[PDB]
Structure 1
Amino acid sequence: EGLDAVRKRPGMYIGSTDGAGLHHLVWEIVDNAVDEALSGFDRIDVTINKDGSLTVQDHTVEVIFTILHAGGKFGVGSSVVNALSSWLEVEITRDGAVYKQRFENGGKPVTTLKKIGTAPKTGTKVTFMPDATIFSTTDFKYNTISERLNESAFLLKNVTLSLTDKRTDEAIEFHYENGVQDFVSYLNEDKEILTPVLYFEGEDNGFQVEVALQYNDGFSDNILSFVNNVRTKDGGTHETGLKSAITKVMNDYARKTGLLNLEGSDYREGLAAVLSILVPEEHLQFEGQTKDKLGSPLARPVVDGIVADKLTFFLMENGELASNLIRKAIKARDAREAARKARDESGKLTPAQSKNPAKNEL
């Protein structure tokens, strides 16, 4: 079924950033599909067809399904996709036969859910072509969809996500077992690794946190965050709490072992980390519209708590790599303020890009 309101104001549902919006809707439907599979009813196939339309099938779940505008993932109208497409087509095949219906121009049906062919098993497919009445560019970019499916696959483990493209006969298929561990591995597979992949999980006061992190020989840190499997593009309390525990527990380790107090970063030079927590509804606050920044003040300590604990223990794992990181840090401070001092004034060295004593040549 289709919804007039989205047509009347598409940006409000999708944000027709065109065709960044066009891709926002595909996120919506496929996330809803995934969600519905997570509901127990274990694979989603996304297919970019050659005629330009998008099939998305799973193997009363039907309208339970097609009604998205639901960035869930968290394992007479209604439904924004059917409403935003010159043609949609819902085929269900459940119990020994296949029922089908299609909808045109905006959501108006055009056939009844009737039967056509008997199928020997079950599943449901939605295929749809968007329209260049509301959309500028209806080209489905294969690499973007591939990417989102990928990260979507790190996040939710009990599901697997395929993506084949009849336009240029290719197909990836994402399934990640190790999870958030494997995420940060993927963040640092282009780079040169240093430390192995760290990983702590947690649960406290209603929060379930899961944080993995590891070092490359790089400068800029890369830290991505999730409240309820949606991303925090601009971070907030949970992130700051994770960051409040790495510089806290390290300075502490610094004073004891590494002798030595240090800046905020310095310890995060080349640190990539993946942060995904689960906040309950009663503790979940954001900022001025858009879930881009977490506000929940309770998340700052509960993340800080969980991570700082685990990190204090697993800092007594080895000391080869611990003193070393605390050594690189003390290095970073020095290098950092060597810019501050040089700046205030307002050497023939031609220095290697990536700091790493182990491999560099002078």
Structure 2
Amino acid sequence: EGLEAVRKRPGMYIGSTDKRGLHHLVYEIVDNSVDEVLNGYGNEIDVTINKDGSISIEDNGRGMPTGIHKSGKPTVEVIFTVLHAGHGVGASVVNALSEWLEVEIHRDGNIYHQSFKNGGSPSSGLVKKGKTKKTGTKVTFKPDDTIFKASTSFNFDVLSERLQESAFLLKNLKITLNDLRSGKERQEHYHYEEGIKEFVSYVNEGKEVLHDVATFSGEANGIEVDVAFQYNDQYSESILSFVNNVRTKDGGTHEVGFKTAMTRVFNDYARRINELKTDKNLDGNDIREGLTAVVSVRIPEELLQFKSKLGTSEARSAVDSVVADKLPFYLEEKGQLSKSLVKKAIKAQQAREAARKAREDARS
């Protein structure tokens, strides 16, 4: 009954039926809690790997609606049983691929509980039972053995990497990952008050840093932007791009917008402090040498287009504008540092030119 289509072709919805597909089920539920925190409701997400094979995902958000949907069915049943109701395949796909799923909604001092079993078949109605001092939703589900053949066991380190990433992107979000399994009991907490500023320092661990993380945010078009960067004394570039708390591994327009404004502001500043003469412009390449940067954007549903590579042409204009508006003032106020970063980029340009001449001489 709709969920049976998900059960016959799971790959078409979660990619695979291996560790990757198993862990994506966890991410679908985590995302709903993340969305809620974005909207200003809640600040805590608890992920618990249970002894029985299940996984619990709890938040302190508003809690799911308890009432009858536009249709004649309880909203909880609509969410978990109606395909793609509300990647974003929905809680209903998690239910379809679960042996059992339990919902717990904390609303106005009361706990509302609903159970699902086998293909995502309601094994109870929404029952009001228990008193509470908190607001939020808790989803516990045990993956189906027949679906995730030899792949139902949750991996702590896989989840930790993704949960730490979510905490870095949403400052003041506290994520706790708990493993209760015998012989594997562990706990980690991810809470970064300085957000993507803390992400940059993390990516630069084990490398010497040239200055403290430079951060700047703003809004251009309908896109919110967060940019953090810090140079190391090494030569590699490490540009991490994110769209709506989710990584875009192949970059896109938001990444292009950051890179173009960075080259433009650096060149303009270099000529202003007379390091470059009337003498060619520094390439992006020279400027980005040893640069670790995090580009995090928030785009409305209407504007979005592509995933892994953003296509939203307006996001180029958005990042370009925030960087071009904020970076000149950073460089002007950090006079000695910025003069040093200009010289550094000139030396990278000179090194590259000498590599080019040696290559040409070896050819001719």
TM-score bucket (shorter structure): 0.7 to 0.9
Partner of 2:70: none
Contact 2:101 2:139 in 1 (8 A): yes
Report the CA distance between 1:267 and its aligned residue: 0.7
Partner of 1:6: 6
Normalised TM-score (structure 1): 0.83
Partner of 1:132: 145
**Aligned counterpart for 1:121 among listed residues 110, 116, 133:** 133
Greater shift, 200-209 or 57-66, is seen at 57-66
Partner of 1:299: 315
What is the 5 A alignment of 1:1-362? 3-16=3-16, 18-39=18-39, 40=41, 42-59=43-60, 61=64, 63=76, 71=87, 79-94=92-107, 98-114=111-127, 118-119=130-131, 121-122=133-134, 123-136=136-149, 137-167=151-181, 168-260=184-276, 261=280, 262-286=282-306, 290=307, 292-344=308-360, 345=362
Aligned CA-pair RMSD: 2.8
Contact 1:3 1:78 in 2 (8 A): no
- Residue 53 of structure 2 aligns with an amino acid whose one-letter code is G
Contact 1:258 1:327 in 2 (8 A): no
**Secondary structure at 1:314's aligned position in 2?**
helix
**Secondary structure at 2:146's aligned position in 1?**
coil
Contact 2:171 2:196 in 1 (8 A): no
Contact 1:32 1:66 in 2 (8 A): no
Report the CA distance between 1:239 and its aligned residue: 1.1
Report the CA distance between 1:218 and its aligned residue: 1.8
Contact 1:2 1:79 in 2 (8 A): no
Report the CA distance between 1:220 and its aligned residue: 1.6
1:5-48 CA distance string (max 9 Å, x none): 32232222211162112111111111113334555263121001
1:172-193 CA distance string (max 9 Å, x none): 1122222222221222123221
Greater shift, 23-32 or 125-134, is seen at 125-134
Provide the C-alpha distance between the structure 2 equivalents of 1:304 and 1:150, rounded to a whole number of angstroms. 27
**Secondary structure at 2:101's aligned position in 1?**
strand
Provide the C-alpha distance between the structure 2 equivalents of 1:209 and 1:38, rounded to a whole number of angstroms. 14
Greater shift, 104-113 or 215-224, is seen at 104-113
Report the CA distance between 1:88 and its aligned residue: 1.7
Task: Call closer, same or farther: CA 1:333–1:207 in 2, change over 3 Å.
Answer: same
Provide the C-alpha distance between the structure 1 equivalents of 2:164 and 2:285, rounded to a whole number of angstroms. 29
1:189-212 CA distance string (max 9 Å, x none): 232211211111112222221111
Percent of aligned pairs with the same amino acid: 61
Provide the C-alpha distance between the structure 2 equivalents of 1:220 and 1:324, rounded to a whole number of angstroms. 18
Contact 2:29 2:139 in 1 (8 A): no
Normalised TM-score (structure 2): 0.83
Report the CA distance between 1:100 and its aligned residue: 3.5
Provide the C-alpha distance between the structure 1 equivalents of 2:219 and 2:37, rounded to a whole number of angstroms. 25
Task: Call closer, same or farther: CA 1:57–1:239 in 2, change over 3 Å.
Answer: same
Provide the C-alpha distance between the structure 2 equivalents of 1:238 and 1:38, rounded to a whole number of angstroms. 20
Task: Call closer, same or farther: CA 1:120–1:17 in 2, change over 3 Å.
Answer: closer
- Residue 267 of structure 1 aligns with an amino acid whose one-letter code is I
Report the CA distance between 1:78 and its aligned residue: 6.7
Provide the C-alpha distance between the structure 1 equivalents of 2:13 and 2:220, rounded to a whole number of angstroms. 34
- Number of residue pairs matched by the alignment: 337
Report the CA distance between 1:158 and its aligned residue: 4.8
**Secondary structure at 1:295's aligned position in 2?**
coil
- Residue 296 of structure 2 aligns with an amino acid whose one-letter code is S
Contact 1:238 1:299 in 2 (8 A): yes
Greater shift, 231-240 or 132-141, is seen at 132-141
Provide the C-alpha distance between the structure 2 equivalents of 1:161 and 1:243, rounded to a whole number of angstroms. 31
Provide the C-alpha distance between the structure 2 equivalents of 1:202 and 1:18, rounded to a whole number of angstroms. 40
Greater shift, 97-106 or 235-244, is seen at 97-106
Contact 2:230 2:291 in 1 (8 A): yes
**Secondary structure at 1:285's aligned position in 2?**
coil
Contact 1:82 1:103 in 2 (8 A): yes
**Secondary structure at 1:294's aligned position in 2?**
coil
**Secondary structure at 1:339's aligned position in 2?**
helix
> Structure 2 regions of 5+ residues with no counterpart?
66-75
Provide the C-alpha distance between the structure 1 equivalents of 2:50 and 2:224, rounded to a whole number of angstroms. 39
**Secondary structure at 2:287's aligned position in 1?**
coil
1:221-261 CA distance string (max 9 Å, x none): 11111222222221112211110111112122222325232
Contact 2:111 2:132 in 1 (8 A): no
